[PDB]
PDB file of C-alpha atoms (C1' of nucleotides) in Angstrom:
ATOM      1  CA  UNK A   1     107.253 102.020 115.595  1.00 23.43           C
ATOM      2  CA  UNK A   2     105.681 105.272 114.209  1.00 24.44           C
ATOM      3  CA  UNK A   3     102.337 104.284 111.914  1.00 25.17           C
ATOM      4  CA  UNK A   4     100.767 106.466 109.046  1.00 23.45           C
ATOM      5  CA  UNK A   5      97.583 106.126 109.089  1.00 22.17           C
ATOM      6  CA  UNK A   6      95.871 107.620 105.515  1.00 21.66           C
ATOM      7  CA  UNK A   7      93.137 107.121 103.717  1.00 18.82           C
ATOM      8  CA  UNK A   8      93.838 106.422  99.798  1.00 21.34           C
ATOM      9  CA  UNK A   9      91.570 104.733  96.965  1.00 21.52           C
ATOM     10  CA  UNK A  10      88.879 105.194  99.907  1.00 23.12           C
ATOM     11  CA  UNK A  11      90.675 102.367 102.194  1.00 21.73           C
ATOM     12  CA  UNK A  12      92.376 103.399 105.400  1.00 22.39           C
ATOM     13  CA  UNK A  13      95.730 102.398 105.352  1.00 24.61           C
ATOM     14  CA  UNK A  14      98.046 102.512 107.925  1.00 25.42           C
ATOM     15  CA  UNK A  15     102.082 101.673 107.602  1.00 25.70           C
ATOM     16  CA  UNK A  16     105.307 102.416 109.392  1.00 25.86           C
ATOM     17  CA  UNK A  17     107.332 104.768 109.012  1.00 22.05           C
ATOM     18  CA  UNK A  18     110.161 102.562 108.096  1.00 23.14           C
ATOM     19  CA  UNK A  19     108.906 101.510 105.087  1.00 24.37           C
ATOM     20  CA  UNK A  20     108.370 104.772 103.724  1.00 25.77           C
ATOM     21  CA  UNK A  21     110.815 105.024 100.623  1.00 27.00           C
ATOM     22  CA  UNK A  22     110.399 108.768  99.627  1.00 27.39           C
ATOM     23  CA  UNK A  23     108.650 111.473 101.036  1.00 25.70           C
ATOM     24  CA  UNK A  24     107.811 115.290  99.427  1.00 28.97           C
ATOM     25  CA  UNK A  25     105.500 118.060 100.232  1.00 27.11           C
ATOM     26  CA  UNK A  26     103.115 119.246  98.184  1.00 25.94           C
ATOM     27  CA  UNK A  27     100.971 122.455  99.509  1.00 22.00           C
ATOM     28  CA  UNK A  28     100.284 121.155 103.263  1.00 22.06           C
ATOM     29  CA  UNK A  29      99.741 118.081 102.036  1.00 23.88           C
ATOM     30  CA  UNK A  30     102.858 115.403 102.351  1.00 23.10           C
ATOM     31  CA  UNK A  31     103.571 112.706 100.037  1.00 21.84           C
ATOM     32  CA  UNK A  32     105.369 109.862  99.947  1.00 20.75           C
ATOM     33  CA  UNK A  33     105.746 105.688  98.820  1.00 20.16           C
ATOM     34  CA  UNK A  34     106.203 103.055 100.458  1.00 22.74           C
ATOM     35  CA  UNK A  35     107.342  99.460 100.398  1.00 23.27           C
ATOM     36  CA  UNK A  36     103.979  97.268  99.736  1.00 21.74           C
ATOM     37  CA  UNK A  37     105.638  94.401  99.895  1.00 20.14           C
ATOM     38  CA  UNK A  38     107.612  94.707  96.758  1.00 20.30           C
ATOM     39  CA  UNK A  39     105.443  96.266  95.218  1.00 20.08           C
ATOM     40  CA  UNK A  40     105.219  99.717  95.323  1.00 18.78           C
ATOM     41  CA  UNK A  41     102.534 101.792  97.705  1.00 18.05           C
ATOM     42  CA  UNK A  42     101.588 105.508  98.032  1.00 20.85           C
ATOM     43  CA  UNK A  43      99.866 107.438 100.277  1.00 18.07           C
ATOM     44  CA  UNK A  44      99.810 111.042 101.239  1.00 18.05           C
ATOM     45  CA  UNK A  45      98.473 113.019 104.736  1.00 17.37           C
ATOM     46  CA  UNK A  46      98.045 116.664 105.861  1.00 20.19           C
ATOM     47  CA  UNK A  47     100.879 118.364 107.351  1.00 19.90           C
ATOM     48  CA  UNK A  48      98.738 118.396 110.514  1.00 14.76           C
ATOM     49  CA  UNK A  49      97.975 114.595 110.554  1.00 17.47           C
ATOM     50  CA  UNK A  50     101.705 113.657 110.442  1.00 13.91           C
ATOM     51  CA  UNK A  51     103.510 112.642 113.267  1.00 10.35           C
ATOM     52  CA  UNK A  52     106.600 114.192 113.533  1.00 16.38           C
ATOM     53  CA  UNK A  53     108.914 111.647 112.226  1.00 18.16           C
ATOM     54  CA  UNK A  54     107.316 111.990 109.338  1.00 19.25           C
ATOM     55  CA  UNK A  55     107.853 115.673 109.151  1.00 21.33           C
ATOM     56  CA  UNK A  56     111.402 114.941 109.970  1.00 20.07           C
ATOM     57  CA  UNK A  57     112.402 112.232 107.244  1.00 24.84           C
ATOM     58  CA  UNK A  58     110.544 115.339 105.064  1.00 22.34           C
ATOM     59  CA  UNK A  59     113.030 117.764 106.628  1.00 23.89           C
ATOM     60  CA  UNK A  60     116.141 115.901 106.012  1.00 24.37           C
ATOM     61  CA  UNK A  61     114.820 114.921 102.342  1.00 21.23           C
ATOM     62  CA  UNK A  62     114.861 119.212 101.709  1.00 20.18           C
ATOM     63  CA  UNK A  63     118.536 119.106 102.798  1.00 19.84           C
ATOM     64  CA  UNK A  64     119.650 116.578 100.662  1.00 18.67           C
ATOM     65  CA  UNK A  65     122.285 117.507  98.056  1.00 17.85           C
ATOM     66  CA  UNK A  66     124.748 116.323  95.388  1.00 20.01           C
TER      67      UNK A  66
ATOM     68  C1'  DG B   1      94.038 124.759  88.369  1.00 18.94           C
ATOM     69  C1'  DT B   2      98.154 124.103  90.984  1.00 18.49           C
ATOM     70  C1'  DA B   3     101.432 122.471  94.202  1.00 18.89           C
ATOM     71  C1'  DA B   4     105.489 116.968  93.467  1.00 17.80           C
ATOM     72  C1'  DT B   5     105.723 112.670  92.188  1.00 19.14           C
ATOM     73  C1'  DT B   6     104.595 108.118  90.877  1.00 18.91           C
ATOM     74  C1'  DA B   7     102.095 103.847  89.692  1.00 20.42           C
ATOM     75  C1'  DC B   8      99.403 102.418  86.272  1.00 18.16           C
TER      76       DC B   8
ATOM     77  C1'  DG C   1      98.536 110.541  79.931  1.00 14.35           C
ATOM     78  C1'  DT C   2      96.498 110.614  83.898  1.00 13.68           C
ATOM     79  C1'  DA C   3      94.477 109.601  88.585  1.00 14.04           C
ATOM     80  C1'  DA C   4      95.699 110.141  93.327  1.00  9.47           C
ATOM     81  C1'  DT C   5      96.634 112.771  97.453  1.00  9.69           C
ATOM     82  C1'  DT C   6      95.164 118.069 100.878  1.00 10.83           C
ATOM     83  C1'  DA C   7      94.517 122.817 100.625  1.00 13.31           C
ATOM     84  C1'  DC C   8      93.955 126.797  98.725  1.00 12.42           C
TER      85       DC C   8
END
DNA sequence: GTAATTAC
DNA sequence: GTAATTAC
């Protein structure tokens, strides 16, 4: 589908997009967790290294209300 | 140091 | 409590 692919605790990681539970911004830089498998996972990219479903599901979180 | 947020 | 993430 659409893969992340980030670089956290020095290991390249990569992970769809559909496992991505929450996303935020932060500067350029975009946040967000994912499901590891039950456990929780979280990674982050630049703003310029995101594809742009990423920058979408981002979008739609700043719209959220209620 | 700070920006948002969380896993640990 | 704090490390982790990009950019400034």
């Amino acid at each position: 589908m659409v893969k992340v692919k980030f670089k956290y605790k020095g290991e390249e990681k990569e992970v769809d997009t559909s496992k991505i539970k929450k996303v935020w911004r932060v500067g350029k830089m975009v946040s967000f967790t994912y499901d590891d498998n039950g456990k929780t996972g979280r990674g982050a990219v630049s703003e310029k290294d995101a594809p742009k479903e990423l920058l979408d599901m981002l979008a739609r979180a700043e719209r959220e209300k209620k």
